[PDB]
Design a protein around this nucleic acid. Structure first.
Lengths: 1140, 402
DNA sequence: GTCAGCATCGCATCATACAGTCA
DNA sequence: TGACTGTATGATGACGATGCTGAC
């Protein structure tokens, strides 16, 4: 069949929800952020945000309101999932242990029912007596709290008003009272009901139906001393209570619809409002009194605070700081100053959080490393639109370059004990040593009295008692700082050469062949302590002390020639504590003792590129938890360094690497430099917190980026991106975009803001000809807002806008390709369009335009109109495949530089999505599922091979291989259809089978073949076959890869095992979660393995790992019926994490 | 009304509509305005055309209610152009039962007054596989494909049997029986997942059997012959059926015991031939013997969301007109049977297949052909939803598109 | 010598009658 | 012995198809 594996490559970045309260403790203020399936909690401290805990849920978080019941120490959190899983959650801390425990849980499903159009609404009454749920039309669901029911059992009431806009529980009432807007033939209205869980029924609400504007869309319960409801529409702003009634219609609000609100002051004096254009408003409630005190409310005031990203939710925090949850752009921490700026904004940005969503179009490019690129780009939207470039690993920014070939080793040096910065960088060469001083950008060359320049240095640096140290092949030399001469010199009693060296501030250990010497550094003397000879040649040494300073190391790490072993010896006795055999015939070239995240490790690198790492116990010197990774093919040099007061490890090789810790686990991140041979940390005033790197021809100095798995560079476009294509031969990208301009009414159209298209270096406008819809053009000023589409050419390095071609009025850009055609050696950009008019629902007209870009300028070469929407197009064997309405057309590129139809297929309702492999063609239809086409070379014609007879509304399509087809679907589900490979009857060959089904919980907009994973460096043969990425509305990026049936069964069983112990966070079953689920049907998952689940196997405890194993049956690839251990399962999941 | 604005938005983006009817402009409006009817031109301008909505979906800016709705006006388009009739084949007698293949889009199987079944395909020709009945008392009043193996069909008969037989027509086994007759089953249904079969009688009892043997059923439901039984797709355990009793009788297949102890029963001014839950399972569309169409919610199964007045009726040799759901979008197709005594807004009413919105009840379309002037009774869209099969004029009709 | 223009012919739902059981 | 539950009956309504005329 088909067997697929899905893992998250990038967690969702869009902020779906915004609620304030504390929850973590009574004393701290907490911020909770829902990112689809991910819930993030922070505490606001001082101009900052602190992560305390991040959890996943087996559900799309739909409701996030946390309530505090009488006699409870802190808020609890109610979350309702899109599959309607409800739960009440509590924050539990136990020393260093943090666990989110489930107090109450339940689904509250209605077996039969139509989910409402304005979606799920969750509310909690002010006395925390119940949860209100608007799930379906005509029904109001009520969850009684009163502690237990522990299962959150519920009942339905009949709501006579069948269409509900918004509901809130009122404050200051005797009985729980709801206030909601509904629409009927009589317009829309504000109503109140008392909720009597007593009797399970409704009672007459305290308020008279009032009459309100038709687009009043949001209800706000104003707290006491005031109570009542505020109702926000598009035109007006009203306050509602029993006899009091207030209405306002501010003109500033008309320009854009208010979409969210947040309470600033607990007394309900002030509110924050956000609209679809990202405008931030302040709503103030003016207090007044009559006798001794009151609630009057006076009147209503609205103020503009400034501009933010378009907000999905708002929460005020403290000291003028507001968090802005955005779905369409970057989320923000924003400051509201009392001084408005030149534009009149009170808003100033403090921090931005990267959001890749919505991810609309994307591509995989190899440009950065030329061998294999692993670059992933995506798109933002509206004023928030952007391109995002996403990269695995760590890059370096060079600030200086000096060519010294044959440089052997690097050490930083502090000649002045007084400024504490390195003013010196010491370099080594074969049989000689050079000193380089650092004054700002300047280096050159210098002498250092006490350091020799005619022996090769193996180590040098700062040592104890205001001294410098240099260890050569001839001797180890101690050197004073202030007065500058040789204070002490150690040589082997027979003058043999030093072979290996290790040194810290107060200790020196050097090897001589098999001999080992431990020296201590004292004032003016190097004192030789006891000494021994080892069984074989010493390969490598390290005496980095782990602990506090200390600065005396009790341990000594060592590698041998003969037995290729890593052993830990004690100082000064050199007593063996652990001999670890590394295996093979390749000697260890580097060994290092380190501390990551308070945990200790031993790293040991061979000349192979292989790297062993072990848990190290500093008290016993025991090496545990052997693990092996591969880091290139050359031998790897390991060097410790500091960044952001954290400890990291740089690895020099044909694939240079940084080793570091996150979530108490070792991670290996790539360095995009071609090659690194030697490396030392550098901190000069000319180069702060820098790195000195060296290869076999040049020596470089510069800084290094933040330590993280993925690098994201943002290139703001200030308009909506739609599609993107890379063009090798032009060294640039093509981008479809559109900007909004408003009717000035007398002259033309003007832009809201500057953008890529109004700021291009060069520009071009469509001049036709015609259609002709001109000459009585039949177009209007109605609906004053207009989209204007452009093709942008963005340079691949600077990401600057090289060229912007604006398309015709009312022309709509749908498709973009980069390719060459026919016998033409020229590379073209090809764009498919549609004409979009307000008074015509589906396009009757469209275009396919062929552009050539050469040196700034794009001439349109092809220019051919066809009748319909050009939904999709793709390069097809030197031909152009295109979707136009219900038609799939194949174009040939003729010698006359024009597009000539060769082939036609007509059997579609609407062909939105096209994908091709070899001669096969996948057409995705809007309502008519999936289509497998074939081009027939001998007929020059199309043949309809097979189709999927299951109705699906597709969002995206991909071919995994000639038999297997990946589909993304409206209900956040993936499915796979295959060609019946067994021929038999026509029936089965015209049938694609859905052999895979899987609920993603995300809406996929784009599929593409590729990997950000390098080559191997294995392994290989490879774990999985193929690599397909996808981008989603929430900004999530995922990966799909193929598995053999044996592996699929291995990981499937592990899941069922993993599923008994997690825990589930609200106790949602992984089963059902991943189950295909639409309005129509439901079903368990098949053909898909949840990579996120399997990967979380590493995050479980050791004993739990063993409990998961049990009777699980391993195969190592040859004749294994055998049982498995804790370590065998770990290695696989470790393998599975490296594929993304 | 509210309806006018509601259709024209067709919502997200809202920025059209929202006007409270413009305060009546300024009335109904008073004197000359719109009018209602003229709500039509604006429907023409207000729309923010599709491929504009598709993009908003992918931005998460618009809800599925938007796109799905707006897709159904791209269905209503191509519907008006459905006017072509792709194929027609007869057998004999009149068309009675219709079964759309659950999977295969070109495969439809229809029943007869005479116990004849035709299996029919497109792009094919290759004349259909046939089975001939005795032709007098052989009336098969309902037909359901066997979900398990598509070569078999569950078919209810006037012969005194509800059976499963291979399309080669050699019967496998019989479930419900007579041993007497002067009575027969009429209604039938199967739910794939449930593996329940349920069948009706003219006397008013049902008999429900598990796909194999072993009934617990047959307690008389109501007094008169039962025209249809509907097993809800989204619910296994429960049911709804149709009788001349002028009652719907929504049921629970399991915990119903007491001999007509039921949950909700829905009264009608007349007898009812159709039950027909929606693929949601969350609505019940009922077709009544003279004029009416009932839509019922799952929120208060008692009060129907609303009625669409339609000209159907009973005639003896007319096969009872049954309204049916679109499997995908929200739409109703009932065959229209014009009478002098209707309220009709369009005499003289050429006799056509009619399409209604649902959730509104207005007519979004009508299907007519000359050279088949035939009155439409059975109209059931294909599970894909791109094709409509009508067994009416003594023949079968597939429309599809040019 | 095809043509519309009648005519008979095919257990539905409704109203009745006076036979069978069966708590 | 009420009840109901089941069998002959004949009024009413008004869609086809097939039969056959009278006649353009």
């Amino acid at each position: 069949h088909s067997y697929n594996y899905v893992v998250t490559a990038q967690k969702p970045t869009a902020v779906n929800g915004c609620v304030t309260g504390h929850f973590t403790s009574a004393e701290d203020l907490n911020l909770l952020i829902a990112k689809n399936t991910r819930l993030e909690i922070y505490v606001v401290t001082a101009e900052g945000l602190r992560p305390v805990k991040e959890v996943g849920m087996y559900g799309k978080i739909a409701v996030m309101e946390l309530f505090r019941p009488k006699g409870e120490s802190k808020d609890l959190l109610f979350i309702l999932t899109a599959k309607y899983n409800a739960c009440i959650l509590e924050y539990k801390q136990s020393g260093e242990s943090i666990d989110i425990i489930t107090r109450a849980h339940g689904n509250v499903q209605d077996r039969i029912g139509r989910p409402s159009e304005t979606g799920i609404i969750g509310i909690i009454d002010p006395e925390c007596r119940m949860i209100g749920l608007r799930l379906y039309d005509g029904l109001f669901k009520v969850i009684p709290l009163d502690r237990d029911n522990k299962e959150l059992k519920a009942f339905n009431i009949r709501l006579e008003e069948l269409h509900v806009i918004d509901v809130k529980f009122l404050y200051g009432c005797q009985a729980p009272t709801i206030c909601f807007v509904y629409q009927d033939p009589q317009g829309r209205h504000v109503k109140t009901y008392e909720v009597s869980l007593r009797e399970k029924e409704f009672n007459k609400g305290p308020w008279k139906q009032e009459n309100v504007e038709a687009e009043a869309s949001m209800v706000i319960a104003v707290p006491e001393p005031f109570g009542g409801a505020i109702i926000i529409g598009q035109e007006s702003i009203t306050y509602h209570n029993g006899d009091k009634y207030l209405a306002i219609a501010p003109p500033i609000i008309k320009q854009s619809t208010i979409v969210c609100h947040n309470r600033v002051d607990p007394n309900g004096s002030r509110y924050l409002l956000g609209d679809m254009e990202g405008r931030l408003f302040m709503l103030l409630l003016e207090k007044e009194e009559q006798m001794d005190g009151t609630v009057t409310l006076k009147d209503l005031r609205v103020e503009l605070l400034g501009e933010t990203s378009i907000a999905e939710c708002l929460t005020y925090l403290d000291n003028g700081v507001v968090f802005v949850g955005s779905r369409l752009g970057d989320s923000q921490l924003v400051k509201l100053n009392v001084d408005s700026n030149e534009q009149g904004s009170y808003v100033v940005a403090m921090e931005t959080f990267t959001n890749l969503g919505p991810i609309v179009d994307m591509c995989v490019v190899d440009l950065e490393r030329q061998g294999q690129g692993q670059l992933v780009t995506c798109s933002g939207a509206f004023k928030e639109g952007s391109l995002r470039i996403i990269r695995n690993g760590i890059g370096i920014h060079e600030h200086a370059s000096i060519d010294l070939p044959g440089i052997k080793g690097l050490w930083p040096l502090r000649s002045d004990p007084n400024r504490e910065t390195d003013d010196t960088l010491v370099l080594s060469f074969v049989g000689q040593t050079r000193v380089l001083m650092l004054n700002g950008e300047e280096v050159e060359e210098t002498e250092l009295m006490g350091f020799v320049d005619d022996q090769q240095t193996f180590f040098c640096g700062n040592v104890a008692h205001q001294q410098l140290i240099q260890i050569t092949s001839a001797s180890v030399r101690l050197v004073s700082q202030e007065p500058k001469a040789l204070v002490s010199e150690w040589k082997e009693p027979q003058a043999k050469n030093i072979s290996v060296a290790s040194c810290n501030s107060s200790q020196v250990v050097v090897a001589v062949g098999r001999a080992l010497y431990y020296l201590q550094i004292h004032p003016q003397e190097l004192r030789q302590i006891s000494h021994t000879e080892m069984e074989h040649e010493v390969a490598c040494l390290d005496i980095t002390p782990l602990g506090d300073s200390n600065g005396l190391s009790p341990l000594c790490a060592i590698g041998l020639w003969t037995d290729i072993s890593a052993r830990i010896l004690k100082l000064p006795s050199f007593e063996l504590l652990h001999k670890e055999m590394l295996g093979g015939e390749i000697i260890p070239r580097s060994i290092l003792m380190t501390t990551f995240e308070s945990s200790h490790y031993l790293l040991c690198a061979l000349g192979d590129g292989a790297l062993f790492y072990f848990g190290l116990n500093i008290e016993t010197g025991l090496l545990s938890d052997r693990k092996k990774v591969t880091l290139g093919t050359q031998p790897t040099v390991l060097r410790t360094f500091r960044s952001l007061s954290t400890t990291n490890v740089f690895a020099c090789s044909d694939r240079p690497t940084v080793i570091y810790s996150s979530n108490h686990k070792l991670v290996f991140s790539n360095v995009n430099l071609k090659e690194v041979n030697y490396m030392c940390p550098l901190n000069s005033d000319g180069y702060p917190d820098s790195l000195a790197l060296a290869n076999n021809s040049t020596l470089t100095i510069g800084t290094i980026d933040e330590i993280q798995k993925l690098h994201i560079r943002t290139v703001p476009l200030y308009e909506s991106p739609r599609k993107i294509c890379y063009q090798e031969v032009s060294q640039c990208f093509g981008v479809l975009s559109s900007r909004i301009e408003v009717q000035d009414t007398s002259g033309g159209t003007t832009a809201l803001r500057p953008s890529a298209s109004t700021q291009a270096l060069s520009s071009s406008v469509s001049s036709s000809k015609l259609f002709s819809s001109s000459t009585a053009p039949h177009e209007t000023s109605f609906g004053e807002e207009v989209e204007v589409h452009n093709l942008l050419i963005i340079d691949q390095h600077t990401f600057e806008v090289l060229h912007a071609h604006q398309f015709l009025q009312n022309e709509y850009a749908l498709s973009l390709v980069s390719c060459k055609l026919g016998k033409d050696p020229n590379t073209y950009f090809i764009v498919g369009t549609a004409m979009v008019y307000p008074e015509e629902a589906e396009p009757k007209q469209g275009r396919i335009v062929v552009f050539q870009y050469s040196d700034g300028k794009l001439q349109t070469v092809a220019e051919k109109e066809v009748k319909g929407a050009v939904y999709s197009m793709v390069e097809f064997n030197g031909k152009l495949l295109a979707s136009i309405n219900s038609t799939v057309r194949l174009y040939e590129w003729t010698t006359e530089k024009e597009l000539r139809t060769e082939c036609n297929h007509y059997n579609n309702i609407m062909a939105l999505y096209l994908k091709t492999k070899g001669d096969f063609i996948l057409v995705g239809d809007l309502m008519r599922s999936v289509l497998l086409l074939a081009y027939k070379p001998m007929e020059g014609n199309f043949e309809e091979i097979a189709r999927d007879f299951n109705p699906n509304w597709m969002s995206a399509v991909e071919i995994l291989d000639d038999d297997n087809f990946l589909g993304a679907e409206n209900a956040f589900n993936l499915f796979v259809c295959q060609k019946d490979s067994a021929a038999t009857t026509d029936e089965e060959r015209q049938h694609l089978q859905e052999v895979g089904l899987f609920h993603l919980g995300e809406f996929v907009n784009v599929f593409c073949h590729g990997s950000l994973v390098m080559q191997n460096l294995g392994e290989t043969s490879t774990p999985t076959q193929g690599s397909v990425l996808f981008g989603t509305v929430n900004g999530m990026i995922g990966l799909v890869t193929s598995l053999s049936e044996s592996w699929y069964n291995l990981l499937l069983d592990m899941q069922n095992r993993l599923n008994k112990v997690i825990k589930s966070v609200g106790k949602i079953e992984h089963s059902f979660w991943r189950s295909f689920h639409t309005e129509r049907k439901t079903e368990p998952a098949t053909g898909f393995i949840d990579g996120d689940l399997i990967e979380s196997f590493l995050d479980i405890s050791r004993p739990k790992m063993q409990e998961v194993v049990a009777n699980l049956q391993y195969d190592d690839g040859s004749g294994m019926k055998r049982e498995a251990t804790a370590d065998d399962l770990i290695k696989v999941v470790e393998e599975l994490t490296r594929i993304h | 009304r509210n309806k006018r604005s509601r259709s024209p938005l067709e919502l997200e983006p809202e920025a059209k509509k929202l006007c409270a009817k413009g305060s009546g402009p300024s009335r109904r409006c008073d004197s000359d305005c719109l009018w209602v009817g003229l709500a039509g031109p604006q429907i023409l301008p207000p729309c923010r055309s599709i491929v504009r909505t598709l993009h908003q979906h992918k931005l998460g800016r618009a809800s599925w209610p938007s796109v799905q709705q707006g897709l159904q006006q791209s269905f209503l388009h191509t519907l008006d152009s459905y006017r072509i009739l792709q194929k027609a084949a007869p057998f004999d007698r009149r068309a009675t039962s219709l079964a759309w293949h659950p999977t295969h889009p070109s495969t439809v199987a229809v029943g007869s007054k005479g116990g004849d079944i035709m299996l029919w395909n497109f792009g094919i020709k290759d004349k259909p596989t046939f089975i001939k009945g005795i032709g007098a008392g052989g009336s098969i009043t309902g037909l359901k494909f066997n979900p398990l193996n598509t070569n078999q069909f569950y078919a209810s008969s006037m012969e005194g049997t509800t059976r499963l037989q291979d399309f080669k027509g050699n019967i496998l086994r019989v479930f419900a029986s007579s041993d007497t007759i002067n009575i027969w089953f009429c209604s039938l249904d199967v739910s794939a997942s449930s593996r329940m079969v349920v069948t009706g009688d003219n006397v008013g009892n049902v008999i429900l059997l598990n796909m194999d043997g072993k009934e617990l059923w047959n307690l008389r439901m109501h007094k008169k012959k039962v025209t249809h039984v509907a097993l809800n797709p989204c619910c296994d355990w429960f049911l709804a059926t149709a009788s001349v009793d002028q009652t719907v009788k929504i049921w629970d297949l399991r915990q119903v015991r007491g001999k007509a102890s039921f949950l909700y029963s829905l009264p009608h001014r007349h007898p009812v031939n159709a039950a027909c839950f929606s693929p949601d399972g969350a609505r019940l569309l009922t077709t009544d013997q003279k004029s009416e169409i009932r839509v019922y919610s799952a929120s208060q199964w008692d009060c129907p969301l609303g009625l669409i007045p339609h000209p159907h009726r009973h005639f003896q040799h007319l096969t009872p007109i049954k309204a049916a759901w679109h499997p995908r979008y929200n739409l109703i197709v009932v065959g229209r049977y014009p009478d002098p005594n209707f309220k009709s807004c369009t005499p003289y009413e050429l006799r056509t297949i009619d399409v209604f919105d649902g959730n509104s009840g207005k007519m979004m379309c009508q299907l007519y052909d000359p050279e088949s002037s035939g009155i439409s009774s059975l109209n059931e869209f294909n599970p894909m939803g791109d094709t409509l099969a009508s067994a009416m004029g003594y023949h079968i009709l597939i429309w599809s598109q040019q």
